[PDB]
Amino acid sequence: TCPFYKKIPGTGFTVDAFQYGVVEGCTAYFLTHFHSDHYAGLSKHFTFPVYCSEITGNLLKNKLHVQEQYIHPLPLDTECIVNGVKVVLLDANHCPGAVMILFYLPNGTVILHTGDFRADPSMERSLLADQKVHMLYLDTTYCSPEYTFPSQQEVIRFAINTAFEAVTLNPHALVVCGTYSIGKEKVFLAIADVLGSKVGMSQEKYKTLQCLNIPEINSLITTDMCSSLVHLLPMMQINFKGLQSHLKKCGGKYNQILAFRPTGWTHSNKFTRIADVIPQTKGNISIYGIPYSEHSSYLEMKRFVQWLKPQKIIPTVNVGTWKSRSTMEKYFREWKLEAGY
Ligand code: NI
């Protein structure tokens, strides 16, 4: 059964609600982005209208085989009427094709559903500038002040400089980057660009990337692993055993691996600066965990919410324990008392 924080009152709509069967009263199912916890349940047998971005619709059609007649892509930053209700899709600064959804209810209420997002001051100059928001369905993944991490730009600077130094010292070093979902493509694209290489990967991952509308992508990626000195591998293989096994397969072309694991936050963020990050090393293999986040830090989340000034907040992450719920509610009240709304 579909939980309350996935339902939009006064409409026939749900958000990210595909794992509950036929939801009673739902006339249109919105999908914010192509991550498995959110799409859980979609397939070629789905026969209701799905509303989403262009990029998410390319992924539904090619990767899950949802039929075309049930895919309804909407352009971003554009007022659209869906089943008699005005909606707008906004870029969520999460993975490719991820949106937030503004719903203008028939009674005058305005609701913002963030989906998953990484808040940014640039959102303060979107179509959100123009009207009041009564209710905020908020991605609370990192809603506690311990959750700090650097900008995406600092993280990429670190990765490019680390990879270029290692391969210039040793032209026989291979770089490997882990992945298990869409998102974080800048990590492997930026490293391949500095090295003058295409990125090599499996046919299954190439297919996924080909759905993303990335400019000049045919110039950046390949399935010919032999031509490439940046390889993508499943995240599960980014360990000393999996990397050893991969280096054997490369036919003595290489004698060293440098590997990257983009994680979200890890407790090593509470002590160490990005500049000071060091790898784990065994022999000729070194693994870096890099804190490349596609979710808001605590401070980015707090700034956005204090700017938006919603009348009510409904968390969509960390909802399963009383302790998490009580912690999140305390921060929401602090924010409101400090800013005066
Ligand atoms: Ni996500």
Residue ranges per structural domain of the chain: 1-147+296-341, 148-295
From the CA atom positions of the chain, what is the Rg in Å? 22
Partners of 221 in beta bridges: 199
Write down the experimental method used for this entry: X-ray
Cα(132) to centroid of ligand 1, in Å? Answer: 26
Alpha helix stretches (DSSP H) within the chain: 36-39, 54-62, 152-169, 185-195, 203-210, 240-249, 298-308, 322-339
Amino acid at position 121, single letter: P
Secondary structure (3-state) at 71 = strand
Under 8 Å between Cβ of 40 and 2: no
Report CA-CA distances (Å) from 206 to 15, 197, 232, 308.
28, 16, 10, 39
Whether 148-295 and 1-147+296-341 are alike in CATH topology: the answer is no
Distance CA 25, CA 14 (A): 10
- Ligand 1 centroid to 116 CA: how many Å? 5
Cα gap 144→287, rounded to integer Å: 28
Cβ neighbour number for residue 312 with a 10 Å cutoff = 11
Unique residue bearing structure tokens 């959804």: 101
Closest CA to 174 of 185, 184, 163: 163
Cα-to-centroid distance, 35 and ligand 1 (Å): 5
CB-CB contact of 188 with 195 (8 Å): no
Other Cβ atoms less than 10 A from the Cβ of 174: the count is 23
CA 256, 262, 266, 269: dihedral to nearest 10 degrees? 80
Residue 247 CA, ligand 1 centroid: distance in Å: 31
Residue 315 neighbours by CB distance under 10 Å: 19
- Between the CA of 166 and the centroid of ligand 1 the distance, in Å, is 32
**Whole-angstrom Cα distance, residue 32 to residue 40?**
12
Q: Would strands 312-315 and 50-52 be described as parallel, antiparallel, or unpaired?
A: unpaired
Nearest-angstrom CA–CA distance, 333 and 339: 10
Options 3.40.50.12650, 3.40.50.300, 3.55.50.30, 3.30.56.10; CATH of 148-295: 3.40.50.12650
Ligand 1: centre distance to CA 178 (Å)? 17
CA–centroid distance, residue 332 to ligand 1 (Å)? 22
What's the 284 CA to ligand 1 centre distance in angstroms? 34
User: Which CATH number is associated with domain 1-147+296-341?
Assistant: 3.60.15.10
Is 97 within 8 Å of 54 (Cβ atoms)? yes
CB 158 within 8 Å of CB 277: yes
- The CA 264 to ligand 1 mean position distance, Å, reads 11
